[PDB]
Design goal:
The structure is cut from a larger assembly and holds chains A and B. By secondary structure, chain A is of the alpha/beta class. Chain A has a 4-stranded mixed β-sheet. Chain A has a 3-stranded mixed β-sheet with strand order 2-4-6, covered by helices on one side. By secondary structure, chain B is mainly beta. Chain B has 1 helix and 5 strands, in the order E-E-E-H-E-E. Chain B has a 5-stranded mixed beta barrel with strand order 1-2-3-5-4. The chains are: A alpha/beta, B mainly beta. At the A-B interface, loops of A face loops of B. The structure holds the ligand NC(=O)OC[C@@H](O)C[C@H](NC(=O)[C@H]1NCCC[C@H]1O)C(=O)N[C@@H](Cc1c[nH]cn1)C(=O)N[C@H](C(=O)O)[C@H](O)c1c[nH]c(Cl)n1, potassium ion (K) (4 copies) and magnesium ion (MG) (6 copies). Chain A binds 5 RNA strands through strand 1. Chain B: Belongs to the IF-1 family. Chain B: Its main location: cytoplasm. Chain B: Pfam families: eIF-1a. Chain B: It is found in: Cytoplasm.
RNA sequence: GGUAUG
RNA sequence: GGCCCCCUGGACGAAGACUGACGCUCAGGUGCGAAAGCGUGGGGAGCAAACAGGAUUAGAUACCCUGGUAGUCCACGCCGUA
RNA sequence: CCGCAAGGUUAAAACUCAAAUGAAUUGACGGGGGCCCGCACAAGCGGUGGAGCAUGUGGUUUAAUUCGAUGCAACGCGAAG
RNA sequence: CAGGGCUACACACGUGCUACAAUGGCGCAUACAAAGAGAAGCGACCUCGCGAGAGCAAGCGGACCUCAUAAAGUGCGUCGUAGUCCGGAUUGGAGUCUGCAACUCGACUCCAUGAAGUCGGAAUCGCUAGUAAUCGUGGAUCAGAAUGCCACGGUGAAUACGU
RNA sequence: GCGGGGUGGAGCAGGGUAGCUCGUCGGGCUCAUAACCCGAAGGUCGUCGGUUCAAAUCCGGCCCCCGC
């Protein structure tokens, strides 16, 4: 039945998707700011953000460079975000902090 | 017969275009080093964080040649 | 049948 | 680029008759000049920059989907470029 | 100079590079087209991937785990012990 | 030069072997190969040992002698779908043989033990005929030490519309 | 003060009848990487019971915990 319509109105409840910005150990200020902007938006518009850093070949040997990038994001997106997850180990070659709308 | 260099260890603090690097040396001075020819030819990659030997010159203590990566 | 990247 | 009427420019052919070099080119100048655009006033079916929502994606400020405003149309003026 | 504006028109130089460029030639490549072949696919039959064990390799370990082979074309390979 | 290591073991992968049974396992009886090796070698018969083997000792540098019963098969019996009379890992005890020597680290036998495994996710390999599959057999290296490699026969399919 | 909820590490589904997402690890695919694909490990589900044939489920306590 047009019953359906009920759902259409029900479906005017809402929904959060997680959006994935991948950073790399040495991304530069310009692109950081672009991706940072993307996240601000993502978050302010009610969404989560799986922020991934993706070491490639030998870069996996200076994981501590990576962690500093994540820590910079956390510290910029501070008043907008709370940090569901942080990583410590480097499973695979990744570090997959998940931020959520404060 | 040539004049002698000053070898010194340092950490690559950032990579720059075309195999140029900032390297903070043992003494704490940051030099803009470039890759050696032998390392270029043999394809030894250098990255941020890598410990490097740097040949410096007395003619300029803001510049060096990375001759080894450890 | 169409994904990009060295 | 439907059809019809009114007003109007050029081209071409046939024979002649007529004028008698009146020609050719042209810096500057003058006019015309797709589309978008601009001003003012109309009009607005369809289409559609912007934009809104829905997707896709690593991201998707796109391509795809549903809508949709300027505009596209008319008058007059402007613009003077492909 | 022109335009209400968007802009148009006229139109340099410093500097830096040792090229930039046109057409065509031979390849290679194309999510261009056309024609073919091979257990390439399809059709089958039996396997591998799961188990235990043998064997080689990576890794890790070690005083040493000797050296070499590393996509196809290293890995029961040099080693027929 | 002796001893150790190349045999290490949280773990990941390549190539294999053996299975998960009844188209089978076990017992007994009984058919049919090819190819090859051999002198400090292959070693019969016979005697002894449950067996691996031992002793004695012929023959053969081989179409002669020896390795050396092919196995799957066939027949009859038994097991009756069970983690089993499937599987044979692992471990204990006891041996044999080669070798100055089998602790690290051999092969094989005997008694005991009897693990995982009930046909294997995504993915992926080989093969078009005497092939695949399966069944034995031999050889090179080699004192000893193949599930590898190189060869040999036995039984013996399925499927190919097509690009 | 008043509530919500406490569910594999992650967070979120779910009167009995525990997933889903992303981690986490390994595999597959590729010349290689991401993407893609498969498998496994992770809970006993706030706690305490009562109570229901059923305890994530029901009911209360408690621990709460943040929102407020
Ligand atoms: N998004 C991102 O970052 O990556 C995803 C992108 O690479 C997907 C890819 N997209 C395309 O080629 C575009 N071609 C133009 C039309 C739109 C779109 O289709 C693609 O695979 N398409 C598929 C459809 C699809 C989208 N997402 C998942 N599947 C497709 O069928 N593409 C067609 C093709 O490759 O020939 C064709 O372009 C098509 C038909 N209809 C549509 Cl829509 N697209
Ligand atoms: K004139
Ligand atoms: K409109
Ligand atoms: K001007
Ligand atoms: K010049
Ligand atoms: Mg003229
Ligand atoms: Mg116009
Ligand atoms: Mg107007
Ligand atoms: Mg429309
Ligand atoms: Mg549209
Ligand atoms: Mg022009």
């Amino acid at each position: 039945e047009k019953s359906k319509s009920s759902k259409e109105q029900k479906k005017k409840q809402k929904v959060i998707q997680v959006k994935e910005i991948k950073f790399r150990p040495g991304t530069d200020e310009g692109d950081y700011q672009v991706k940072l902007r993307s996240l601000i938006r993502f978050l302010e518009e009610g969404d989560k953000a799986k922020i991934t850093l993706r070491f490639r070949g030998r870069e996996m040997a200076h994981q501590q460079i990576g962690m500093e990038v994540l820590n910079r994001v956390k510290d910029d997106l501070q008043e907008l975000a709370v940090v569901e997850s942080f990583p410590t180990k480097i499973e695979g070659r990744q570090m997959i902090m998940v931020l959520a709308p404060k | 017969a040539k004049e002698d260099n000053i070898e010194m260890q340092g950490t690559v603090l950032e990579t720059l275009p075309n195999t140029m690097f900032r390297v903070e040396l043992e003494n704490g001075h940051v030099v803009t080093a470039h890759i050696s020819g032998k390392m270029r030819k043999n394809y030894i990659r250098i990255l941020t964080g890598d410990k490097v030997t740097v040949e410096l010159t007395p003619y300029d203590l803001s510049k060096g040649r990375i001759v080894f990566r450890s």
